[PDB]
Amino acid sequence: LSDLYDAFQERRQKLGLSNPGLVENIAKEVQRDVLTTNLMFSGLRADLTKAFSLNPLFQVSHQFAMGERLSPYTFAALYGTSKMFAQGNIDDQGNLSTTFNYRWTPSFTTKTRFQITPGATGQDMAQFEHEYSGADFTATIKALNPSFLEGGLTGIFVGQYLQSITPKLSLGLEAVWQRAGLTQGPDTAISYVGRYKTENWIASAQLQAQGALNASYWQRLGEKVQAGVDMTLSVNTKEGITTFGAKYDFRMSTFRAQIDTKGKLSCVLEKRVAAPVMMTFAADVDHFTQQAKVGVGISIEAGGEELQDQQPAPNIPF
Amino acid sequence: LSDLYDAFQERRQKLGLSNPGLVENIAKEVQRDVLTTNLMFSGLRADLTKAFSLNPLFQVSHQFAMGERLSPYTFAALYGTSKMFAQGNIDDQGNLSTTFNYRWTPSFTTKTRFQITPGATGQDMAQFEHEYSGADFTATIKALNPSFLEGGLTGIFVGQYLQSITPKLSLGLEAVWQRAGLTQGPDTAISYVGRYKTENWIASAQLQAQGALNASYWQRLGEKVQAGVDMTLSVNTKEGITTFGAKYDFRMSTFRAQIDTKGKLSCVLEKRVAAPVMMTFAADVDHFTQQAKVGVGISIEAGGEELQDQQPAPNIPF
Amino acid sequence: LGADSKQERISKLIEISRVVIHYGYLPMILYLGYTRSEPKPSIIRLLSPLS
Amino acid sequence: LGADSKQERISKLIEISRVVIHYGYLPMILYLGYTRSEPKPSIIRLLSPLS
Amino acid sequence: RGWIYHKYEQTTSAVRKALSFAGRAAWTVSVTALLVGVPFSLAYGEDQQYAAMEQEQ
Amino acid sequence: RGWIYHKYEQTTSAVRKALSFAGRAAWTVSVTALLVGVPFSLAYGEDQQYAAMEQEQ
Amino acid sequence: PITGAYNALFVSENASIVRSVVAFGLAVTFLASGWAEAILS
Amino acid sequence: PITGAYNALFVSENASIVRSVVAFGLAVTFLASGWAEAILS
Amino acid sequence: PQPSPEELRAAEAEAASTIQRAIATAAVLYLAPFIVDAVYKMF
Amino acid sequence: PQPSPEELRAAEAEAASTIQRAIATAAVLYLAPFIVDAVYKMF
Ligand SMILES: C[C@@H]1CC[C@@]2(OC1)O[C@H]1C[C@H]3[C@@H]4CC=C5C[C@@H](OCCC(CO)CO)CC[C@]5(C)[C@H]4CC[C@]3(C)[C@H]1[C@@H]2C
Ligand SMILES: C[C@@H]1CC[C@@]2(OC1)O[C@H]1C[C@H]3[C@@H]4CC=C5C[C@@H](OCCC(CO)CO)CC[C@]5(C)[C@H]4CC[C@]3(C)[C@H]1[C@@H]2C
Ligand SMILES: C[C@@H]1CC[C@@]2(OC1)O[C@H]1C[C@H]3[C@@H]4CC=C5C[C@@H](OCCC(CO)CO)CC[C@]5(C)[C@H]4CC[C@]3(C)[C@H]1[C@@H]2C
Ligand SMILES: C[C@@H]1CC[C@@]2(OC1)O[C@H]1C[C@H]3[C@@H]4CC=C5C[C@@H](OCCC(CO)CO)CC[C@]5(C)[C@H]4CC[C@]3(C)[C@H]1[C@@H]2C
Ligand SMILES: C[C@@H]1CC[C@@]2(OC1)O[C@H]1C[C@H]3[C@@H]4CC=C5C[C@@H](OCCC(CO)CO)CC[C@]5(C)[C@H]4CC[C@]3(C)[C@H]1[C@@H]2C
Ligand SMILES: C[C@@H]1CC[C@@]2(OC1)O[C@H]1C[C@H]3[C@@H]4CC=C5C[C@@H](OCCC(CO)CO)CC[C@]5(C)[C@H]4CC[C@]3(C)[C@H]1[C@@H]2C
Ligand SMILES: C[C@@H]1CC[C@@]2(OC1)O[C@H]1C[C@H]3[C@@H]4CC=C5C[C@@H](OCCC(CO)CO)CC[C@]5(C)[C@H]4CC[C@]3(C)[C@H]1[C@@H]2C
Ligand SMILES: C[C@@H]1CC[C@@]2(OC1)O[C@H]1C[C@H]3[C@@H]4CC=C5C[C@@H](OCCC(CO)CO)CC[C@]5(C)[C@H]4CC[C@]3(C)[C@H]1[C@@H]2C
């Protein structure tokens, strides 16, 4: 009866909890904000982005690239709204990656992704994601290549849960169920996560039940500097790597540098060389082989000048 | 008798001729000043140069490099004087390249070069060069690995002659004699060169008697811009390539760009990012394969600030 | 367990949907943008990179 | 034509000269510089890269 | 009937070839303009700022 | 006699190993200081020029 | 007529020589005519 | 004593794990102790 | 080799049990803040 | 195969003749400006 639900929720709200965010973001500050891993590239790269409006967000992008595992050309377009976000990008070889996110409810959103490769049968993947963001938790279920055609379920199904335990501590869970086909038995994995977040530092751990462990620590070293440490241990042979890095935010540039136990040094400099133009320098150095990989990239955004008067749409479900 | 020599030279001087320079410099303005060929590199490179004096010139250099066919480290030192120039550089693998140039006379100079590779027997080369610069000509003879040990001459002997015909036209010759050993007969090649040089444009041709032809044209496109075209034809299969390029001299940077008939685009930007520090960006693009080679380099010169009062030594025979 | 004809036809629908997605997804986004952006750009300018 | 002993000894001189050049050439330049440059640097500063 | 289907295939080969050339030609023109025009515009633009700072003296 | 020659070889192996480590360690320290210190000093130095232009207002 | 311009310029053993000689002639005439300075300077 | 520090840290199957755990502990204590800010900020 | 008909049962059951205890764990976490708070109140 | 004793003579002579005409060409070039000037004077 509602008599319990009303009293139960009132006690729940008195605990001062907040939404802990996604399980995949539990270590975002180290692995994405401080570390270079997601910004590293080699060769030449150029992105030309034209923004046609901010509400609804609509922009078109052309990427030219010549480098390791970089497709020569990629056309992209995105359309955003407070309730929806559609994105598509296609390679010169016809590989199409699509995104369609829709807010059915302010708390419930469905994310649909397709990957279509024409030249190679490869993986033509369909991923159906359902996220619920509660007052103090978030729950997600992903279905990747779901099928019932063989008379039984097939594909990869991932459940995720993250719960705020205290205003600082969140604990969570991820569970996977897999079956390549009815010829084989289903495979299941469980991962445990947790995070302690304060204003100046954040600690996170990801524990795969099969033996892998990822621990990360982030700390703000003043207004312009932040640093973080990322340790990955695999004991499934035994392998361990620790990456330490720092990020500096200047008025017109951001500098990142990191070193890791495998002797790899890498740095990324992003520099606002002009009002619409941002240059990127990325360098990777392996001290064991004395080999370096250098990436120079440019980004230009024509659209914004005319549209600055108009305002970006709130809560686009990217 | 001197009666003829005095009258002969007086008529010679009345012709308004001047020293035409070296045969190897007959196309310098295109191939070295405008084109990118000698500045292109890939990967990371850093040169640290300390100058200890300008008269006598003495400086020490450390090069760090990580790239295609770039040795990880190279120590170098040079000592210069109006009468002599000694230079040595050695790799991390012990490859020593040496130079010793001496002005026996203001018109006559001997250049001695050694290459010593410890790890691989390879080529341990000794090159003995003798240059004479006359009032209107220059003559050179090079002996590379000369030997009389087998009871007969062996090695590569190159004679060069360049003659000013008019204040603008110089014509020249290069002749080679080769013998790998007394087991085989001597091989001889002749190359013809010429150049027409004016204030705004320079035309050069190099004609190998065996069939290769190199034509180049340089033109100054105003105070800050110069351009040049380089054609190489080989008819020994038949192969031809034409490279067109331009160089821009700005206050704090020099930009070079070139394209050639083989579809290769390359550019080099040299930028004075600081008083002692010069950055270099080099990019090579092959339009047939859509592959790019990127080189980022830095050069720093600590020494000059204290020594600016002192003046560089005149006529160092580099 | 299953049905042979039902599986054959269902798979055929997926390859129809896959082809429609492959060809129609980006033109769809461009249509949503072109007709709802403020202001509305030109048809040629809609795909111009920086003009 | 030639002489066996003369060729053996001459070649030996070249490998002596080659070893002296390989080891002594750069120290020689550094000595010429250090003793004749104006002003004269320090022995440690002589090989310092940028200090 | 089949005469139309052969023509359809004949068109596809030529048209697909035409689009591949046009797309490949457009790529090289774009990449050339970027690799030359970007460093030049930054170098030329900085040179003009120094020229302004001299004129303002 | 031979006892000295063996010691000479024993020294050469250890000393050549020592120089290779010292040279290799010096290279990585230099390359690390360059690749991190050069972009940082240019970025940090430019930031200070903007800070000066604000203070001078 | 036009076929004789294609074969010797793109599908013959000496076509590479012809292409470079034409590219050299065009580049020099571009520079020497003053059009390059009027555009590049 | 010292030999037991070398073998488990550089020449054992689990030595890679030990090295990364030590590098993680040192980096976190460097940051958390305030020495990093006093040097890097 | 391919699994026999009851070896699939073992795999299908073992997979089901892991997912049943995963959802059981998420239920404990959801109720956990009421428990953690009480211990702080006791302190 | 290796060259016979008179085939080396042919190679040694042919190489000598090319170098003799190279030095002969350089002598003509050295004297050439007196010739080129005279034609201009005639004009
Ligand atoms: C599933 C796995 C379980 C472990 C884990 O998730 C993964 O779960 C979290 C538990 C966290 C700790 C809990 C509490 C504190 C007290 C705090 O004290 C600050 C001052 C305070 C007085 O103590 C104010 O009064 C310091 C930090 C510490 C020890 C946390 C560190 C990070 C930890 C280890 C997190 C870790 C990532
Ligand atoms: C199981 C996995 C192994 C790795 C790991 O868990 C997961 O192990 C945990 C240990 C944690 C540290 C413990 C205590 C402190 C002291 C605190 O300082 C505030 C002062 C305060 C008490 O000292 C009184 O003022 C700052 C944070 C810090 C350093 C924690 C950081 C995160 C760490 C490294 C966690 C890390 C992610
Ligand atoms: C061994 C090979 C023989 C060819 C060559 O070396 C190699 O030797 C040179 C001969 C040169 C030409 C001689 C004279 C002129 C007249 C001048 O006229 C300007 C105005 C003038 C009136 O004519 C003033 O009054 C234009 C240029 C031209 C044709 C030269 C071009 C470059 C040439 C072809 C050079 C070429 C590189
Ligand atoms: C055998 C090899 C084949 C390639 C080559 O020789 C070597 O062939 C030559 C032809 C030469 C051009 C001929 C004439 C002119 C006209 C002049 O313009 C001044 C105006 C003036 C006469 O027009 C009256 O004012 C500028 C120079 C230019 C373009 C020469 C440039 C160099 C060229 C390309 C030479 C090139 C190196
Ligand atoms: C058509 C294809 C795509 C676009 C393109 O051709 C090919 O068109 C060219 C025009 C170039 C820009 C011209 C002028 C400048 C100003 C300079 O300085 C501004 C300083 C800032 C300080 O805030 C304002 O003062 C910065 C660079 C920029 C924007 C050029 C960038 C590259 C561009 C986009 C080139 C690019 C290659
Ligand atoms: C010991 C080893 C070699 C040297 C080294 O450590 C390792 O030592 C570091 C010191 C750095 C310099 C510090 C400050 C600046 C000023 C900045 O701005 C000036 C602007 C200009 C305008 O004319 C004057 O105002 C330009 C860069 C520069 C010179 C740094 C360059 C890199 C250097 C040399 C670093 C290098 C990695
Ligand atoms: C044998 C090979 C075939 C290709 C080629 O040699 C090699 O054949 C040559 C013919 C030359 C042109 C002849 C005459 C002139 C007039 C001159 O003067 C005009 C005045 C000017 C203002 O200055 C414009 O009004 C300008 C130059 C030009 C066009 C020559 C350009 C180079 C060319 C194309 C040379 C080219 C490289
Ligand atoms: C299990 C694994 C072994 C390694 C490790 O976990 C993983 O073991 C943990 C022990 C931690 C330290 C314990 C206590 C403190 C005091 C705290 O407060 C002081 C006040 C400060 C001012 O703020 C200085 O006075 C500062 C931090 C520090 C040193 C911890 C640092 C991180 C450490 C090294 C953790 C490390 C990552």
Numbering used by the authors:
A (entry chain B), B (entry chain A): 21 to 256, 265, 267 to 347
C (entry chain J), D (entry chain I): 21 to 71
E (entry chain C), F (entry chain D): 62 to 118
G (entry chain G), H (entry chain H): 16 to 56
I (entry chain F), J (entry chain E): 8 to 50
Sentences from the paper on this structure:
The translocase of the outer mitochondrial membrane (TOM) is the entry gate for the majority of proteins imported into mitochondria as precursor proteins, or preproteins. Two other preprotein receptors, Tom20 and Tom70, are loosely bound to the TOM core, forming the TOM holo complex. We determined TOM core and holo structures with and without the bound MTS of rat aldehyde dehydrogenase (pALDH), revealing numerous interaction sites with the Tom20 receptor and the Tom40 translocation pore.
By performing iterative rounds of 2D and 3D classifications, we obtained a C2-symmetrized map of the TOM core complex at 2.7 Å resolution for the pALDH-bound state. At 2.7 Å global resolution, we were able to build the core components of the TOM complex with confidence. As with other species, the dimeric complex is shaped like a shallow funnel, where the protomers are tilted toward each other at the cytoplasmic side, and contact between the two Tom40s is mediated through β-strands 1, 2, and 19. Five in each protomer were modeled as phosphatidylcholine (PC) lipids, resulting in a total of eleven lipids in the dimeric complex, including the interfacial lipid. Additionally, we modeled four detergent molecules per protomer as GDN. Presumably, owing to the rigidity of Tom40, we observed several clusters of small unassigned densities within the barrel that could be interpreted as bound water molecules or ions. We note that these densities are present at the interface between helix α2 of Tom40 and the barrel, indicating the inner helix is stable and unlikely to be involved in the conformational changes important for gating preprotein translocation.
